[PDB]
Design an enzyme around this catalytic site. Structure first.
Site, PDB file in Angstrom:
ATOM      1  CD  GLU A  35     -35.867  29.731 -56.250  1.00  0.00           C
ATOM      2  OE1 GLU A  35     -35.873  30.700 -57.050  1.00  0.00           O
ATOM      3  OE2 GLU A  35     -36.721  28.777 -56.328  1.00  0.00           O
ATOM      4  CG  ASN A  46     -41.799  36.319 -60.868  1.00  0.00           C
ATOM      5  OD1 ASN A  46     -40.794  35.671 -61.164  1.00  0.00           O
ATOM      6  ND2 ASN A  46     -42.115  36.597 -59.609  1.00  0.00           N
ATOM      7  CG  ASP A  48     -47.070  37.296 -61.698  1.00  0.00           C
ATOM      8  OD1 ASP A  48     -46.031  37.922 -61.490  1.00  0.00           O
ATOM      9  OD2 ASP A  48     -47.510  36.534 -60.801  1.00  0.00           O
ATOM     10  CB  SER A  50     -44.979  39.131 -58.630  1.00  0.00           C
ATOM     11  OG  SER A  50     -44.601  37.923 -59.316  1.00  0.00           O
ATOM     12  CG  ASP A  52     -39.405  35.465 -57.639  1.00  0.00           C
ATOM     13  OD1 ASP A  52     -40.582  35.709 -57.294  1.00  0.00           O
ATOM     14  OD2 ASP A  52     -39.135  34.496 -58.356  1.00  0.00           O
ATOM     15  CG  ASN A  59     -43.870  35.984 -56.260  1.00  0.00           C
ATOM     16  OD1 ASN A  59     -44.834  36.710 -56.081  1.00  0.00           O
ATOM     17  ND2 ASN A  59     -43.508  35.539 -57.462  1.00  0.00           N
ATOM     18  CG  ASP A 101     -49.242  29.237 -47.283  1.00  0.00           C
ATOM     19  OD1 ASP A 101     -49.852  29.653 -46.251  1.00  0.00           O
ATOM     20  OD2 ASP A 101     -49.558  29.492 -48.482  1.00  0.00           O
TER      21      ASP A 101
HETATM   22 RU   LIG Z   1     -39.902  32.435 -58.148  1.00  0.00          RU
END
Ligand SMILES: [Ru+3]
Ligand SMILES: [Cl-]
Ligand SMILES: [Cl-]
Ligand SMILES: [Cl-]
Ligand code: NA
Ligand SMILES: [Ru+3]
Ligand SMILES: [Ru+3]
Length: 129
Positions: A35, A46, A48, A50, A52, A59, A101
């Site tokens: 990551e 990202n 969209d 967002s 990270d 995120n 989650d």
């Molecule tokens: Ru990610």
């Protein structure tokens, strides 16, 4: 801060990730490697809109507030900036919520694609924990 591999393994274990929700420490170290390359300050936008954040690329669409991700939640109740600190506490605590989650570590697409099913124990081989 850029962690070394054993240094982060050791920190992750200290902060309660070893076998958290059944995921051995090597899974967490492998996820962090792919990551962020073990860099607490890593940030990636990202598609969209967002972003990270941090050693585990948490995120802003769901987990932290960065004030620029419309429509998003802040389920860890933290500014995303906290996820960039040399101290991994906020990253780790938020990662515990994410992995609880429902989809486990598949929440980290790099873990699914690069760590899942592999010899993750190699990531902690030789470490004084
Ligand atoms: Ru990610
Ligand atoms: Cl490495
Ligand atoms: Cl699971
Ligand atoms: Cl990937
Ligand atoms: Na958010
Ligand atoms: Ru262990
Ligand atoms: Ru610590």
């Amino acid at each position: 801060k850029v962690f070394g591999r054993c240094e982060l393994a050791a920190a992750m274990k200290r902060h309660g990730l070893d076998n958290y929700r059944g995921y051995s420490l090597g899974n967490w170290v492998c996820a962090a490697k792919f990551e962020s390359n073990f860099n607490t300050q890593a940030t990636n936008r990202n598609t969209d809109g967002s972003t990270d954040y941090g050693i585990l690329q948490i995120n802003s669409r769901w987990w932290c507030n960065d004030g620029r991700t419309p429509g998003s939640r802040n389920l860890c109740n933290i500014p995303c900036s906290a996820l960039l600190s040399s101290d991994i506490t906020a990253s780790v605590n938020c990662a515990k919520k994410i992995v609880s989650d429902g989809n486990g570590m598949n929440a980290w697409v790099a873990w699914r694609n690069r760590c899942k099913g592999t010899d993750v124990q190699a990531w902690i081989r030789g470490c004084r924990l």
